[PDB]
Write an enzyme that holds these catalytic residues in place. Structure first.
Site, PDB file in Angstrom:
ATOM      1  N   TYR A  29       0.850  -1.178  -0.066  1.00 28.84           N
ATOM      2  CA  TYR A  29      -0.221  -0.162  -0.141  1.00 28.84           C
ATOM      3  C   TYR A  29       1.152   1.643  -0.210  1.00 28.84           C
ATOM      4  N   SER A  31       4.638   2.988   1.801  1.00 22.02           N
ATOM      5  CA  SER A  31       5.702   3.108   2.875  1.00 22.02           C
ATOM      6  C   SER A  31       5.315   3.971   3.961  1.00 22.02           C
ATOM      7  CB  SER A  31       7.352   3.733   1.961  1.00 22.02           C
ATOM      8  OG  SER A  31       6.958   3.415   0.692  1.00 22.02           O
ATOM      9  N   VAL A  32       5.829   3.349   5.051  1.00 26.40           N
ATOM     10  CA  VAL A  32       5.276   4.092   6.140  1.00 26.40           C
ATOM     11  C   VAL A  32       6.635   5.002   6.960  1.00 26.40           C
ATOM     12  CG1 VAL A  32       4.374   4.570   8.670  1.00 26.40           C
ATOM     13  CG2 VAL A  32       3.660   2.801   6.455  1.00 26.40           C
ATOM     14  N   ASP A 162      -6.909  -0.410  10.153  1.00 27.73           N
ATOM     15  CA  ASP A 162      -6.374  -0.842   8.915  1.00 27.73           C
ATOM     16  C   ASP A 162      -7.535  -2.078   8.793  1.00 27.73           C
ATOM     17  OD1 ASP A 162      -4.007  -0.060   9.224  1.00 27.73           O
ATOM     18  OD2 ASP A 162      -2.548  -2.638   9.530  1.00 27.73           O
TER      19      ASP A 162
HETATM   20 MG   LIG Z   1      -2.745  -4.593   9.974  1.00 28.25          MG
END
Ligand SMILES: [Mg+2]
Ligand SMILES: Cc1n[nH]c(=O)nc1Nc1ccc(C(C)C)cc1
Ligand SMILES: [Cl-]
Ligand SMILES: [Cl-]
Ligand SMILES: [Cl-]
Ligand SMILES: [Cl-]
Length: 346
Positions: A29, A31-32, A162
């Protein structure tokens, strides 16, 4: 418009407003990075979406995630602290960054490494159901409730995160994997459409695990897991069987020897009788007959936390876009509008 500055962290360029400092990489999804937000004083998670508009499905998924996060305003649900792009016009718009509260431990970190009293279980499940009452009142389904999607702090305070964005794939659900152990049996093989009662099944699986320290249905594959579930809760009775419309489901189910529902007090040995009673009301095979989140909050097991004046519902949430057919550029322009209209919380 704020001033942006650029830096490269692990082969990725991050262009963010000056208010975000001390970025440190943390983890398809996107990068964090963990960062310090000088405006709010919170430690935050900053996510840079990977290729948000590469296809129609991806562009619509980007819009879906942003609409959902902008809507959630509840103590027990992850909310959106900020969203931004370095673009100065729709025509150069390409990158989307999402900012949320930084999460320390999840319920996995706690279930594996703590001795939980009954009082701990009461408070943790109470908070899940309080957030779920809010989510379900907006006609949203989470779809992916499991211990790794529940954040918990040192004061035992919990947030749901999430949300299922219809992102998990077939390979992600295959074999001996926690991704599937919390899913309701009527959707594990898509024998029924998704509906909000599947989230209550997941809460039952989580509650059992908090009580015993063990996964309730750790199946090695879809069929092994169904066999574990049916041994506990029984094979379908005549009344439920009348309601089963999938011919695929009916053909296979009738091949199984019939089993009665088990005695939950002999499965969850030593647990509070009120916790056993609530589990029996969540883990019902017939989803029509499962307890709802609003009903569960009034169950005696939560008598010391339940406050009907402090269990709020959500503003209505318009999901009509889900049935809409648009081009990539049109999904992208709708996403741009939601970015620039964002107003932060107080
Ligand atoms: Mg999760
Ligand atoms: C409640 C319900 N309503 N409609 C339907 O088609 N099926 C339903 N339930 C159902 C329950 C269990 C199973 C398998 C897991 C035994 C399949 C369908
Ligand atoms: Cl700034
Ligand atoms: Cl951009
Ligand atoms: Cl998990
Ligand atoms: Cl809305």
């Amino acid at each position: 418009r704020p001033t942006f500055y650029r830096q490269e962290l692990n082969k990725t360029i991050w262009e963010v407003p000056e208010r975000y400092q001390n970025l440190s990489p943390v983890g398809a999804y996107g990068s964090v990075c963990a960062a310090f937000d000088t405006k709010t004083g919170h430690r935050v998670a900053v996510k840079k979406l990977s290729r948000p508009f590469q296809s129609i499905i991806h562009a619509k998924r980007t819009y879906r995630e942003l609409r959902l996060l902008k809507h959630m305003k509840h103590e027990n649900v992850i909310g959106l602290l900020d969203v931004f792009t370095p673009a100065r016009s729709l025509e150069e718009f390409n990158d989307v960054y999402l900012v949320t509260h930084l999460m320390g431990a999840d319920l996995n970190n706690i279930v594996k490494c703590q001795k939980l009293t009954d009082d701990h279980v009461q408070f943790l499940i109470y908070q899940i159901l309080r957030g779920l009452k809010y989510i379900h009142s907006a006609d949203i389904i989470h779809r992916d409730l499991k211990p790794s999607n529940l954040a918990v702090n040192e004061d035992c305070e919990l947030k749901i995160l999430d949300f299922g964005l219809a992102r998990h794939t077939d390979d992600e659900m295959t074999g001996y994997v926690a991704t599937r152990w919390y899913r309701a049996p009527e959707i594990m093989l898509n024998w029924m459409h998704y509906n909000q009662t599947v989230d209550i099944w997941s809460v039952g699986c989580i509650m059992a695990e908090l009580l015993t320290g063990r996964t309730l249905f750790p199946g090695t594959d879809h069929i092994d897991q169904l066999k574990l579930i049916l041994r506990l809760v029984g094979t379908p009775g005549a009344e439920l069987l009348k309601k089963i419309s999938s011919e695929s489901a009916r053909n296979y189910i009738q091949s199984l020897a019939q089993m009665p529902k088990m005695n939950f007090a002999n499965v969850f040995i030593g647990a509070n009788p009120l916790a056993v009673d609530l589990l029996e009301k969540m883990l019902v095979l017939d989803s029509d007959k499962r307890i709802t989140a609003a009903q569960a909050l009034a169950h005696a097991y939560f008598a010391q936390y339940h406050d009907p004046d402090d269990e709020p519902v959500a503003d209505p949430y318009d999901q009509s876009f889900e049935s809409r057919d648009l081009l990539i550029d049109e999904w992208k322009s709708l996403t741009y509008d939601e970015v620039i209209s964002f107003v932060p919380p107080p």
